[PDB]
Write a protein that binds this DNA or RNA. Structure first.
Lengths: 94, 141, 76, 58
RNA sequence: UGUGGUGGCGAUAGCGAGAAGGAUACACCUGUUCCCAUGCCGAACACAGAAGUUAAGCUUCUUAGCGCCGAUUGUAGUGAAGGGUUUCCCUUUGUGAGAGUAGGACGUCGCCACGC
RNA sequence: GCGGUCGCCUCCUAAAAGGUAACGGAGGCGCCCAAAGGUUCCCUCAGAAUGGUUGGAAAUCAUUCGAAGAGUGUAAAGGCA
RNA sequence: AAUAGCUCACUAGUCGAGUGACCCUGCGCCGAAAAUGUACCGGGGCUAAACAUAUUACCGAAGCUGUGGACUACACCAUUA
RNA sequence: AUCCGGGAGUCAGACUGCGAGUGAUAAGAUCCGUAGUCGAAAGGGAAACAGCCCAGACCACCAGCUAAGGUCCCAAAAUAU
């Protein structure tokens, strides 16, 4: 219902290698009303939605306010790791 | 000296390659598969030995998937021949495998026989492996 | 026991003046073999598909929509 | 603005960009000061000689 | 203002699909005597005409099925600094694609004439 | 030493200006055409599907789909509807 | 040669706190055998005098500065130079 | 930096970091691009060591500050927090 929405900057250059060794999610969103921002995630909040509902869920993203229903495109892995990278979101309405 | 699989030529000698890294290239056929998580050449004969170590635990069913194929060719000179003249006659058909890629896949058999056959395979390949399902899809069906 | 080791000389193609220059009459701009860039204003084509500048002026490059490019000289 | 510029490392064994960009500024010996304004040419000098020069402001 | 002629601008201008029209204009159609023509053939090409038809071409309108143009964001790759095995990998600093997308989009501008 | 090679032209190696070696990896040349040249007009290919006597997978035909999958005297690139 | 097998299932038949199964990661172990004498820490030696994360002090060169002498070049200042 | 003249040397190069080739993606191998040092470079460090990390000596002094690398004893500096 209420995941972790923490904003980012335009080009955080190669500090993102340290974001691999600390358990962080560099994540995309682009959708219907509000165009595009990069947002933090931490990996222990999807698994309630994952192992409760499945793969066609409704994530209710926040702007620290009213919710935004998304229609998840890719939440993929990296090789040899099993963690969250290149997580292309997508959001169409009800 | 058993080669299962070859090409049709179009060029004899090829440049010895240079492999660094890969990613993705996941399970798509199946339900149980390896992951070569180093980088090496893998010849013909290793894939024969991997076939047979698969299939002698695949009795009456269960699909075998071979996803890697020897395209390129090595060459070698003789012993007693100096350095010098042109490239020696090609003997062998070897393809590279980087990290990430998947050696073989299985489906149609429960988990225990699957991990048996996959550890029978991975003692015949020079790369450290793992074992990965077709873990999650948008529709697993 | 090798039957190789044969080459041609290098014949040094490529653009021989940039944009924004001041270019005198009849000097080569972009030597080709095969038409890769067509001429525009004040630029002609020799026997081996080279590109002159007929009038003194400034070389500037253009493009014909999607496929191929142009050279043209404007005095200033 | 104004920027103070000093060598605090040798020039030896580093390529022909960095020698010549040093000689363009007026840095002859080690620990020699040069005071120059803040354009965007001189900032471009410092962003390639960052690993040889300590820069302060005036 | 309709129609015809005629130009540039990256197909965002296109392709497929559907509907409507003949005031003028355009087009089909009638014919070959004449300039003219077919390696055979008035199909074209060329020249005479005007019984009719909007069926086709053409013009206007609808449409996101194929094609086109697609931001931001994440990643591979890499200049400059560094560190380990030295086959290869990793860290700071600058720059970032290709795919995959939200989306835009069933044109825009200029001139002359005729009819109204 | 015995073998192979010695001039010229294309491609790759060649690190996206140009240049760059090896007894590195691939092919041609020591000509031809009095029209295969100049100009002025006109024109658009390879295939596939469906029918039609000899007539056959594959001749001459006919309609439709068809941006190139063809041709360019000759090796290879770059071009050309 | 069947066949006894804490009655290889249970009775809380007893006593009265935790006991299994997977992954991911930091540091180790085995795997590890050659020729004059220890014999790849430089030696001594070390349970930190090893490693990992952070913080100040200090040692360290013909590098830099301090006082002085010489030479060359451009200058200043005033004849002289 | 260019132009005009007077006078030479050089045409055997090495290794290291990075792109490639032949080789067995073997060699202090061989052959090319690209940067540094050595050749023509003394001083400090890696025990000793042309090519690796720091740094380019006009000369004197029993003065001072740091680099690379270090601080229990040979051997100068923490038995540091």
């Amino acid at each position: 219902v209420q995941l972790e929405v923490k904003e980012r900057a335009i080009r955080p250059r190669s500090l993102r290698n340290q974001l691999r060794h600390e358990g962080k999610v560099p994540a995309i969103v682009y959708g219907y009303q509000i165009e595009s921002t990069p947002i933090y995630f931490e990996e222990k909040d999807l698994s309630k939605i994952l192992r409760e509902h499945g793969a066609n869920t409704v994530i209710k993203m926040t702007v620290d306010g009213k919710n935004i229903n998304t229609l998840m495109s890719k939440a993929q892995l990296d090789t040899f790791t099993g963690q969250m990278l290149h997580v292309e979101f997508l959001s169409v309405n009800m | 000296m058993l080669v299962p699989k070859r090409v049709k030529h179009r060029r004899e000698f090829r440049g010895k390659m240079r492999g660094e890294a890969k990613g993705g290239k996941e399970v798509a056929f199946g339900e149980w598969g390896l992951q070569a998580t180093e980088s090496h050449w893998i010849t013909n004969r290793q894939i024969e030995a991997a076939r047979i170590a698969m299939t002698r635990y695949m009795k009456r069913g269960g699909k075998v998937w071979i996803k890697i194929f020897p395209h390129k060719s090595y060459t070698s000179k003789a012993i007693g021949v100096r350095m010098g003249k042109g490239k020696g006659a090609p003997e062998g058909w070897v393809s590279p495998v980087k990290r990430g890629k998947i050696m073989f896949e299985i489906a149609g058999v429960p988990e225990e026989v699957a991990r048996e056959a996959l550890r029978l395979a991975s003692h015949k390949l020079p790369v450290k492996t793992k074992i990965v399902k077709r873990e999650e899809m948008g529709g697993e069906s | 026991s090798t039957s190789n080791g044969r080459d041609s000389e290098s014949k040094r193609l490529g653009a021989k003046s940039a944009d924004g220059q001041t270019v005198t009459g009849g000097s080569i701009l972009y030597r080709q073999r095969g038409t890769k860039i067509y001429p525009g204003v004040n630029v002609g084509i020799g026997g081996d598909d080279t590109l002159f500048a007929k009038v003194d002026g400034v070389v500037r490059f253009e493009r014909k929509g999607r496929d191929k490019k142009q050279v043209s000289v404007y005095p200033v | 603005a104004e920027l103070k510029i000093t060598l605090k490392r040798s020039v030896i064994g580093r390529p022909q960009n960095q020698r010549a960009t040093v000689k363009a500024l007026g840095l002859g010996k080690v620990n020699s000061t040069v005071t120059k304004p803040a354009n965007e040419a001189i900032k471009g000098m410092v962003n390639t000689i960052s690993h040889l020069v300590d820069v302060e402001e005036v």
